[PDB]
């Protein structure tokens, strides 16, 4: 069981597009997630990978695979801090009762994507990390189960 952050490109130059992708594997019972992706605003700017629209405070992660089934009522939210380089995205079903009794666990899959148009040639860091939004976290990740209790003991993998 782990949450991973994958970048499809590691070392490139200015004006290029880096798709960061938040992913979960074997997160059994997961009914909801909150992640924090910390970046440097001076070196990198947050954008939508499909159209190229910049990220504001209310902007969600692109193209969720997990926690998106309308049967179980997804409640998506984002309170990002672009000024201080934080993506704060939360997603969380309401109808847990049905989700657990269906006999399907949303364990492995994509949480969401975020584009990153590069501004400077100097090298920087991109990772899942604690903020003011996520106290009592595992490397800037909170995860609940279909009973509402916080899941603990999964690993959080960063990119290179």
Author numbering: 4 to 163
Q: What does the literature reporting this entry say, word for word?
A:
In addition, cellulosomes are central elements for the production of readily available sugars in the gastrointestinal tract of a variety of mammals. It is now well established that a wide array of highly ordered protein-protein interactions involving dockerin and cohesin modules (defined herein as Doc and Coh, respectively) mediate both cellulosome assembly and cellulosome cell-surface attachment. Primary scaffoldins, in addition to containing multiple type-I Cohs, have a divergent type-II Doc that binds to type-II Cohs located in cell-surface anchoring scaffoldins, providing a mechanism to tether the cellulosome to the bacterial cell envelope. In addition to ScaA, inspection of C. thermocellum genome revealed the presence of an ORF (Cthe_1806) encoding a protein comprising 2177 amino acids and containing a putative type-II Doc, which was termed CipB. Type-II Docs of primary scaffoldins ScaA and CipB in C. thermocellum possess two distinct Coh-binding surfaces that recognize different Coh partners.
In ScaF Coh this residue is replaced by a Ser, and the β-flap is placed further away from the Coh-binding interface. This comparison indicates that the side chain of Phe136 in the ScaC2 Coh would clash with the side chain of Asn122 in ScaA Doc, strongly suggesting that the ScaA Doc is unable to bind Coh ScaC2 in this orientation. However, considering the inherent symmetry allowed by the interaction of two Doc helices to the Coh platform, it is possible that, if rotated by 180°, the ScaA Doc would be better positioned to bind ScaC2 Coh, a hypothesis that was further explored below. Thus, in order to probe the mechanism by which CipB XDoc binds to ScaF and ScaA XDoc recognises ScaC2, the crystal structures of ScaF XDoc in complex with ScaC2 Coh (CtCohScaC2-XDocScaA) and CipB XDoc bound to ScaF (CtCohScaF-XDocCipB) were solved. Strikingly, the data revealed that the two Docs bound ScaF and ScaC2 in different orientations. In contrast, ScaC2 Coh recognized ScaA XDoc, predominantly through helix 1 and CipB XDoc through helix 3. When the two complexes comprising ScaC2 Coh were overlaid (CtCohScaC2-XDocScaA and CtCohScaC2-XDocCipB), it was evident that the XDoc modules were in reverse orientations highlighted by the X-modules, which were positioned in opposite directions. Both ScaC2 Coh and the type-II Docs display a high degree of similarity when these protein modules were independently compared, which is reflected by the low r.m.s.d values (0.5 Å for 160 Cα atoms of the Coh alone and 1.1 Å for 54 Cα atoms of the Doc module). Although the nature of the hydrophobic interactions is almost indistinguishable, the ScaA Doc, which binds ScaC2 predominantly through helix 1, makes an extra hydrogen bond to Phe136 through Ser108. Steric constraints do not accommodate Asn158/Asn122 in binding ScaC2 and thus these residues are replaced by Gly125/Gly155 when binding to this Coh.
